[PDB]
Amino acid sequence: RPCQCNDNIDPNAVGNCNRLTGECLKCIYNTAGFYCDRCKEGFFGNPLAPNPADKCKA
């Protein structure tokens, strides 16, 4: 983890982190927010759940 941020990013693809603001640019598990502490618009629920089945669903 080069850039500080919640645990919602993939080390495989590139760009997952913002090189200017230092914040998750594209959280992985349908989550959004400066710290991936939210749910992408369209899916609601809990973006900070241990299980992906209870994350942010429609």
UniProtKB/Swiss-Prot annotation:
It is found in: Secreted, Extracellular space, Extracellular matrix, Basement membrane. Disulfide bonds join 3-17, 5-24, 27-36, 39-56. Found in the basement membranes (major component). Residues 3-58 form the Laminin EGF-like domain. Laminin is a complex glycoprotein, consisting of three different polypeptide chains (alpha, beta, gamma), which are bound to each other by disulfide bonds into a cross-shaped molecule comprising one long and three short arms with globules at each end. Binding to cells via a high affinity receptor, laminin is thought to mediate the attachment, migration and organization of cells into tissues during embryonic development by interacting with other extracellular matrix components. The alpha-helical domains I and II are thought to interact with other laminin chains to form a coiled coil structure. This is Laminin subunit gamma-1. It comes from Mus musculus (Mouse). The chain holds residues 824 to 881 of 1607 of the full protein.
